[PDB]
Point group: C3
Chain length 491, copies 3
C-alpha cells in the first residue's frame, strides 16, 4: 500500500502473420504486407499506353497489306497486341527471318508508309491474284508492287532511289516463286529471274525457284518477303530480270517506347502502367508472379508466389483476480492505442497508457523501409521474346538462358531482401522496447528496483499524477528519494 | 571466514579455431565453420538417377545420321548424352551448316526415335551407297538418308509431299551431294547442275551444289551438306529436286524434355548423384561449387571463389592460483557441455555448469540459417554451350558474355552472403551471452554487484544448492536480502 | 540536509561536426553523418592514357581498312595492340567493298590484337595477278588492297582454278578473300571471259560459295563496281581449297590468330601521356571506386557500371550538433572534441575538463576501414566484351545484345544500392555501439560510487580531482578507495 508497480510492455494481436527472417523459416509478427503481385483483372487497360488491337491481323499482314488488314494503314501504337485468331487471307508468303522483321517494326511502333514513284518503265505493274480479293476484284498486298511482262518482254531492271532525308527507310519487297514453268514464262518471259536489292552497305541476291511452294488457299506458288534498310546518304538499288515484287515506297523507322505482345486478353476502359499477356496488373508491389512477359513500368518477375514483408513487432499473445506483467513474459492484447506502453498499479487503482514517442519511433523506421522498397518502378518496353512456338536451336537457347538467369537472380534478391528486412524489422522493434525500459529505469534512479519481469517496484506513494510524471519525461527523483530509500533499506 | 561468493558468466572456447570473413573484418576466428563451395569430384559420372547414354566412338550427329559404326544408337533415348573426345566419323564425308543448332535441338529432344515414311520416289533409284561408308562387308550409306540417283539414264524432276497429320513436331534430316567432278555430276544426276528445295508453308530451303569444292576425306574429294527441317502439325513437307538430293527416309520424333548433352571424358560409374559435370558428378549439399560451370541437373551454383566458409559458432577467444574470470576477458576452453554457463567460487570450492536454454537459443539460430542456405536446389538441364573450339565471333561473344556476367553476379551474391551471415552469427552469439548475464543480474536484485569482468560478487553465504537455484531460476532474493544488504553497506 | 558533501560530474560524449553529409540506410532515405566517401566514379579527364595498355590510334583507318590494305593504311601493316581505337573521322579510299557480317570480322580481328600477315605463295599459274584499279591509288600508280590479289585474264583465258594450301604448323590461320561484282557485262568478259563466275573457298569443316552479280553495286568513288569480302579460318591439320573459274579476289596469305586481352573501342578522345588501368570512350577513369557512371563501354580493370550517379558510403558516426552544467551523448554530440571520436567531459572542484578516449576511437576507425578494404578490393578486369552501342537497325540478335547488357546494369545497380544501404546502417550501429560500450565500461568500474544521471553522465559521490578523473579515464580507478565516502553521500548514515 506504500508502493506502486510500473510495468513495461508491447502490444499483441489475436491473429498474427508468419514471415521469414535470416534465422527462422516461420516467425509470427503483428502485421505484414505482400510484396509479390500475383493477381490481375484480366483486362488490358487502354490507358495510359496507346494500345492497338490487331484483332484478325498480325503485324506482318498489316505491314504488307493483306486486304482485310487495310484498316491498319499508317497506324501507330505503343503496344500492338496480336491475337490468336489472326489469319492470312491474301497471297501465300513466307518471311525468311520472320522474327526480326516483326521485332524492328514493333519497336518502331508505326506503319506510316511513304509512297515513292519508281521508274518501272518496260514492265507492267500492280499485278493481282484471285487469292487476294480486295473487295470483289483480284488484288494483292497494298504495299507490294508485282511486276510482270509488258508487251511480251521483260528487260533487265536497273532502278535506284536515294535517301536524302535525315531518317531511316524500311523498304519491304519480295520474290515470286511460280507454280509451273508455264507461269514463269507467261509472267516473266525468261526461264529464271534474278532479284538483287543493294545498298552501299548491303546486298541481297535471291534466286527464285519454280514450283517450290506447297498448296495454300488455291495456289502452289508464293512470294518470299525480304527487307532492306537504307540509311541517310545511302541509296536503294533494285536489279531484277524476273520475279520481282517491288516496293511501293518505304515505312518510316522511328525509335521509341513501342513493342508487341501476344495476348487474348480483352481491352478495357481503365488505367494501368503495367501490362501482361494475362492482363493489366498494378505496379504498387516490387515483385510480380503473373508473367515474365511485361510491357511498361512493372514489378520484377520472380519465381515466388508470395513474399511477406513484416510491418510489425513479434506477436506474443498473453494467453493468460487482476495482475500486471511486463514485456518479459508476453505482449499485451489489450493495448490498441500504441505499440509500447505502461501498465501501472498504485494507490488510486490501476491503469494503461501507451507511449507515443517510442511507437512513432518504430513506425517511422518500419514505414521508411517500405518507401525504400517501393521506390523502384523500373520501366521497360521492347525486350526479348520469352515464349516460343517453333523449335529453333542455338539462338533461342541463349534467349531462354538469359531470361531464366535474370529470373533466378531477381528471385534470389527478393528472397534475401525480405529475409534481411524482416530480421531488421524484428530487431529494431525489440530495441525500441528496451530503450523505453532503460529510459524509465534511469528516471527512477534509486527510487525503484527492477523486478525481472519488465516491471518496476516503486518504493514510495505514486498517485496517478506521479505515474504521469514518469510517462511524461518530468519525474523528479529528489522529491521521493528519502521515502524510497527508507522502504528499500530495512533490516 | 568469508561472507561472499563469486559467480562468473562465460562462454566456451576451442584450441583449433577457424578464420572467416565478415562485413567488418577480413579474418576473424570463430569456434566452428562449414564450407559452402564444392570444390572436389570423385571423377565419375553416376548413372543414377539420370539416364546416361555413353556416346563412345560416336557423336550425336553421327548417331543421328546413321554412320554404320553407330548403328547401335538407333532409336535410343537419353537424359544426358555424353560425347567422348575419341569419337570419330567413318561414313561419307559431310558438313553441317549451323552444326551447333542441330546438335542442340536433337540433344534437348532427347530421343533418336525414327519413324519410317515411304516417299514415292518413282523415276529414280534409291539406297545409293559408297565404299567410304562400309556397313559390314557391304558398300552402304547413312542409315537414315536415301541417296537418290539416276534410273535408266534419266533423272526426272521430283515432286513429293508428306503431310504431318500428327499432333507433334517432325524432324526431317536431308542433304545435298557435291560431286567431285563434272563427269561424276552427269553420271549420277544427268543434269549439269542440280537444285534441292525443301519447303513448308512457313519456310523454304533451296540449295545449289558446288562441284569439286570438297577436300579429300577418306578416299573421296566429294561430300554432302546436311540440312534439317521441322514440319509442324497441319503443315506439310514438300521436297523438290532436279539433282543431287540426299533424301530422308522419315522423321525423328521431337519431344520436350529434361534432356541435354555434355562433352566429357570422365568414366561412367555405378553410383547415384543428382549433379553432373564434365569433371564428374559432384555433391549438391553445398549451395555453391567451383568444379565446372558446365552442369546438368540439380547442381550447386558456379562461383569464382574456391572457398567460402560459413561461421557456425561464436567468436573464438582463448581463456589463457588464478581468480575465476568471466566472458569480458575471454572464453572457457574447459567448458564442454554447452556454449554458455556459470563458473562459481564459494565456501564449498569452485564449480562449473552449462546453461541449456542459452545454448539451444544460439544453436537453433545457427541451424535455422543453415537450413535456409541449404534449402535452394537449383535444377537446370539443357542450357547453353560454355566452351568453344572454333572461332565464331558475334554469337559466341554474347554466349561468353552472358555466362561470364552470370558467374560474376553469383560470385558477388555468394561473397556478400557469407559476410552478412557471419557478422550476424557473431552478433547473435554475443547477444545470448549478454542476455544470460543480464538475466542473472536481475535475479540477484540487491544481493550482488557487477565486478566488471563478467562476474558477480554475491554478498552472502552461497553454497552449491544456492548457486543451483540461480542457475535454474529458482533463486529467492528475499531470503538472502538482509544478509546481503548487511555485507554490502558497511562503513 | 541537501547535497552537503561535495560531488563530481563525469560525462560521456561523441564528436560532432558542422558540415555533415547525408547518406542512405535501410531505415532512412537521408540521415546525416560526419564523414562520407563517394563510391561512384562519374568524372573523367577525357584522355585515353597510353599506359599501361598498348593503345593503337586508328586515325584515318578502321580495323578492316587496315586489315585489307587500303593504301592510306599501309602504316598499320603487321601492327599489334591491346586496345585499338577506331576514330569516327575514318574513311575508305580504295576499291568499293561490303562485308557480310562485318561485325564478326571486326570482332575476331580485334580479339586477336594483331595484323601479323604471313605471305604464302599460292600456285596461280594460268592466270595473271596484281589486278589494279585507279580508285585505289598507291603513290601515283593504280593499285589495290595490299593483302588481296586480283586475278584476271591470262592470254585471254581464265580456267577453273584448283588451289590448295595446307595448315602444317600449329595454331589457326585467318584467310581474307573476296568476290568481284563487275559493273557491266563488258567488264565481266574483259576480265574473266566466262559469263558468270563462281568463287568457292572450302575446308574440311565448311564450304563458302558465292555467285557474283553484275551491276549490283551502286556508284562509289567513280565505279559502279564492288567486291564482297569473305573470310575463312583453317584450323591446324585442316586445309584451304580455292575453287574458282571467275570473279575471284584471292588472298596473299593468312593473318596469324592469337588469343588474348586485345579488343577494339570507338572513341574520339585524344591519346595522352599518362597511366590508368581503365579506359572508356569518354577517356580513362580512376579504378579506386567500386562503381562508375561514365560509360558502360569499358576496357581493362574498371569499376562496374551503375545507373546511379552517386552512392555515398558513411565513414563516420551520426552527426548530432551541440547553464554551466555539462551533458553527455544522450542529448547531442560535442563539436568541441577535435582529438577523438569519443571521450569524457568532467566538472569537479578543480574546474571543467575534456579528454578523448583513444581505445574506442580506433575501435570504430578500424571497423570502418575493415569495411572499405572489402569494398575497394574489387579489381574486375574485363577486356574484349560485346558491343554496346549500335548504328544499324538489325533486329533479333541486336535485341538480345541490348537486353543482356540492360539486365546486367540493373542487377549491379541493385547490388550497389543495397550494399550502400546495408554498409551505412551497419556503420551507424557500430559507432553507436562503441558509445554505449564505453559508457558501460565506465559504469562498471565506478561500482557503487556514482549514479547514472540519465543524460549519459555520472554523478560521482566523492571528491574527484583531475588525477581522480584521470584514473577513471586510464581504467586504473580503484573504487574501494572511495567507497566509504561515496556510500556516505549517496545514502544518509
Ligand atoms: C526510266 O527508264 C526508261 C527506260 O530505261 C531504263 O533505265 C535504266 C535506268 C535501266 O532500268 C534500263 O534497264 C532501262 O532501259 C528511260 O527511258 C529512256 O530515256 C532516254 C532519255 O529520255 C531515252 O533516250 C532518248 O531516245 C530518243 C530516241 O529514242 C527512240 O529511238 C530509239 C532508237 O533510236 C528507240 O530505241 C527508243 O525506244 C525510242 O523509240 C533520242 O532521240 C533522245 O535524244 C534520247 O536519247 C530512251 O529512248 C528511253 N528508253 C525507252 C525504252 O523509252 C527513262 O529515261 C527513265 N526515266 C527516268 C525519269 O529516269
Ligand atoms: C506436287 O504435289 C502436290 C501434292 O499432290 C500437288 O499439290 C496438290 O495440287 C492439287 C491441284 O488440284 C490440289 O488439289 C486440290 O485439293 C483441294 C483440297 O481441298 C480441293 O478442294 C481442290 O478441288 C483440288 O482438288 C491438292 O490439294 C494439292 N495437294 C497438296 C498436298 O498440295 C502439287 O500441285 C504438285 N506440284 C505441281 C507443280 O503440280
Ligand atoms: C560444426 O558445425 C556443423 C554445422 O554444419 C556441424 O555439423 C552438423 O552436425 C549435425 C549433428 O552433429 C549433423 O546433423 C545430421 O543431419 C543429418 C541430415 O542432414 C541426419 O541424418 C543426422 O542424423 C544428423 O542429425 C549435420 O549434418 C552436420 N552438418 C554438417 C554440414 O557437417 C558440426 O557438428 C559442428 N562441429 C562441432 C564440433 O560441433
Ligand atoms: C508415284 O507417282 C508416280 C508419278 O511419277 C505414279 O505413276 C504415274 O501415275 C500417274 C497417275 O496415275 C500416271 O499418269 C497417267 O498415265 C497414263 C498412261 O497412259 C495416261 O493415260 C494418263 O492420262 C495419266 O497421265 C503416270 O503414267 C504414272 N507413271 C508411271 C511411270 O507409273 C505412281 O502411281 C506412284 N506410285 C505408286 C502409286 O506406287
Ligand atoms: C585439286 O587439287 C587437290 C590437291 O592436289 C586434289 O586433291 C588430291 O587428290 C589426290 C588424288 O589421288 C589425292 O592423292 C591421294 O592421297 C592419299 C593420301 O596420301 C592416298 O592414300 C591416295 O592413294 C591418293 O594418292 C590427294 O591427297 C588430294 N589432296 C588434297 C589436298 O585434296 C584434287 O583432286 C584436285 N581436284 C581437281 C578437280 O583437280
Ligand atoms: C533446480 O534447482 C533446484 C535447487 O537446486 C532443484 O530443486 C531440488 O534439487 C535437489 C537436488 O537436485 C533435489 O533433492 C533430491 O530430492 C529427492 C527427492 O526427495 C531425493 O531423493 C534426493 O536424494 C535429493 O535430495 C530436490 O528434490 C529438488 N526440489 C524438489 C522440489 O524436487 C531442482 O531439482 C532443479 N531443477 C532442475 C530441472 O535442474
Ligand atoms: C573522411 O573519409 C575519407 C575516406 O575514408 C578519408 O580519406 C582517406 O584519408 C587517408 C588519410 O588519413 C588516406 O590514407 C592515406 O593515403 C595516402 C595515399 O593517398 C598515404 O600516403 C597515407 O599513408 C595514407 O595511407 C586514404 O587513402 C583516404 N581515402 C580516401 C577514399 O580518400 C578522409 O581522411 C576522412 N576525413 C576525416 C576528416 O576523417
Ligand atoms: C544503274 O543505275 C545507276 C543509277 O541510275 C547508275 O549509277 C550511275 O552511274 C553513273 C556512271 O557514269 C554515275 O555518273 C557519275 O556521276 C558522278 C557524280 O555525279 C560524276 O562526278 C561522274 O562524272 C559520273 O557522271 C551516276 O552518278 C550514277 N548514279 C547513281 C544514282 O548512282 C549505274 O551506272 C547503272 N548501272 C550500270 C551497270 O550502268
Ligand atoms: C560519355 O560520352 C557519351 C557519348 O558517347 C555521353 O552520352 C551523351 O550524353 C549527353 C548528355 O551529356 C546526351 O545528350 C542529351 O542527354 C539528355 C539527358 O541528360 C537527354 O535527355 C537528351 O535527349 C540528349 O540525349 C547524349 O544523348 C548522350 N549520347 C550521345 C551519343 O551523345 C556521356 O554523357 C558521356 N559521359 C558522361 C559521364 O557524361
Ligand atoms: C593516464 O595515462 C596517460 C597516458 O599514459 C598518462 O599520461 C602520461 O603519463 C606518463 C607518466 O605516467 C608521462 O610520462 C612522463 O613524461 C615526462 C615528460 O615530461 C617525462 O619527463 C617522464 O619521465 C615520464 O616519461 C607522459 O608524458 C604522459 N603523457 C603525455 C602525453 O605527456 C597519465 O599520467 C595517466 N594518469 C594517471 C592518473 O594514471
Ligand atoms: C575440371 O575440368 C576443367 C577443364 O578440364 C579444369 O580446368 C582446367 O584446369 C587446368 C589446370 O591444369 C587448366 O590448365 C585449364 O586451362 C583449365 N580449363 C578451364 C576451361 O578452365 C578444372 O580444374 C577441373 N576441376 C577439377 C576439380 O579437377
Ligand atoms: C488481425 O485482426 C485485426 C482485428 O481488427 C484486423 O484489423 C487486422 O487487419 C488483422 N491482421 C491483418 C494483418 O490484417
Ligand atoms: C498467365 O498466363 C500464363 C500463360 O497463359 C499462365 O501459364 C499463367 O498461369 C497465367 N497467370 C495468371 C496469374 O493468370
Ligand atoms: C506508415 O506510416 C503511417 C503514419 O502514421 C502509419 O499510419 C502506418 O501504419 C505506417 N505503415 C506501417 C507501420 O506499416
Ligand atoms: C508534461 O510535459 C509537458 C511538456 O513536455 C508539460 O507542459 C506538462 O505540464 C507535463 N505534464 C505534467 C502532468 O507534468
Ligand atoms: C572405338 O574404336 C577403337 C578403334 O577402332 C576400338 O578399339 C574401340 O573398341 C572402340 N570402342 C567402342 C566403344 O566402340
Ligand atoms: C602448279 O605449278 C606447277 C608448276 O609451276 C604447274 O605445272 C601446275 O599446273 C600448277 N597447278 C595448278 C595451276 O593448278
Ligand atoms: C582509414 O584509415 C586511414 C589511414 O589509417 C585513415 O586516415 C582514415 O581516416 C580511416 N577511415 C576513416 C573513415 O576515417
Amino acid at each position: 500500500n506504500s508502493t506502486a508497480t510500473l510495468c513495461l510492455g508491447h502490444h499483441a494481436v489475436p491473429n498474427g502473420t508468419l514471415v521469414k527472417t535470416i534465422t527462422n523459416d516461420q516467425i509470427e509478427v503483428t502485421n505484414a504486407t505482400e510484396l509479390v503481385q500475383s493477381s490481375s483483372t484480366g483486362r488490358i487497360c487502354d490507358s495510359p499506353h496507346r494500345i492497338l488491337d490487331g484483332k484478325n491481323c498480325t503485324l506482318i499482314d498489316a505491314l504488307l497489306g493483306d486486304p482485310h488488314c487495310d484498316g491498319f494503314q499508317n497506324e501507330k501504337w505503343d503496344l500492338f497486341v496480336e491475337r490468336s485468331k489472326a489469319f492470312s487471307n491474301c497471297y501465300p508468303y513466307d518471311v525468311p527471318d520472320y522474327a526480326s522483321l516483326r521485332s524492328l517494326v514493333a519497336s518502331s511502333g508505326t506503319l506510316e508508309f511513304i509512297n515513292e514513284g519508281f521508274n518501272w518503265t518496260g514492265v507492267t505493274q500492280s499485278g493481282g491474284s484471285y487469292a487476294c480479293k480486295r473487295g470483289s476484284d483480284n488484288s494483292f498486298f497494298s504495299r507490294l508492287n508485282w511486276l510482270y511482262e509488258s508487251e511480251s518482254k521483260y528487260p533487265v531492271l536497273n532502278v535506284t532511289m536515294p535517301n536524302n532525308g535525315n531518317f531511316d527507310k524500311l523498304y519491304i519487297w519480295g520474290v515470286h516463286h511460280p507454280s509451273t514453268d508455264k507461269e514463269q514464262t507467261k509472267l516473266y518471259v525468261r526461264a529464271s529471274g534474278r532479284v538483287t536489292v543493294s545498298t552501299k552497305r548491303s546486298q541481297q541476291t535471291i534466286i527464285p525457284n519454280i514450283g517450290s511452294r506447297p498448296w495454300v488457299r488455291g495456289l502452289s506458288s508464293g512470294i518470299s518477303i525480304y527487307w532492306t534498310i537504307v540509311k541517310p546518304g545511302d541509296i536503294l538499288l533494285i536489279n531484277s530480270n524476273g520475279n520481282l515484287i517491288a516496293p511501293r515506297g518505304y515505312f518510316k523507322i522511328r525509335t521509341g517506347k513501342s513493342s508487341i505482345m501476344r495476348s487474348d486478353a480483352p481491352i478495357g476502359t481503365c488505367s494501368s502502367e503495367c501490362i501482361t499477356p494475362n492482363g493489366s496488373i498494378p505496379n504498387d508491389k516490387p515483385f510480380q508472379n503473373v508473367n515474365k512477359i511485361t510491357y511498361g513500368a512493372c514489378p520484377k518477375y520472380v519465381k515466388q508466389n508470395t513474399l511477406k514483408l513484416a510491418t510489425g513487432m513479434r506477436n506474443v499473445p498473453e494467453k493468460q483476480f487482476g495482475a500486471i506483467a511486463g514485456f518479459i513474459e508476453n505482449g499485451w492484447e489489450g493495448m490498441v492505442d500504441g505499440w509500447y506502453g505502461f501498465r501501472h498499479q498504485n494507490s488510486e487503482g490501476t491503469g494503461q497508457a501507451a507511449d507515443l514517442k517510442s511507437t512513432q519511433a518504430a513506425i517511422d523506421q518500419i514505414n521508411g523501409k517500405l518507401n525504400r522498397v517501393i521506390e523502384k518502378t523500373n520501366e521497360k518496353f521492347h525486350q526479348i521474346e520469352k515464349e516460343f512456338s517453333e523449335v529453333e536451336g542455338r539462338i533461342q537457347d541463349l534467349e531462354k538462358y538469359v531470361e531464366d538467369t535474370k529470373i533466378d537472380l531477381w528471385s534470389y534478391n527478393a528472397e534475401l531482401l525480405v529475409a534481411l528486412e524482416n530480421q531488421h524489422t524484428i530487431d529494431l522493434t525489440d530495441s525500441e522496447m528496451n530503450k523505453l525500459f532503460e529510459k524509465t529505469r534511469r528516471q527512477l534512479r534509486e527510487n525503484a528496483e527492477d523486478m525481472g519481469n519488465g516491471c518496476f517496484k516503486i518504493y514510495h506513494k505514486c498517485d496517478n499524477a506521479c505515474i504521469g510524471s514518469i510517462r511524461n519525461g518530468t519525474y523528479d527523483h529528489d522529491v521521493y528519494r528519502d521515502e524510497a530509500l527508507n522502504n528499500r533499506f530495512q533490516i
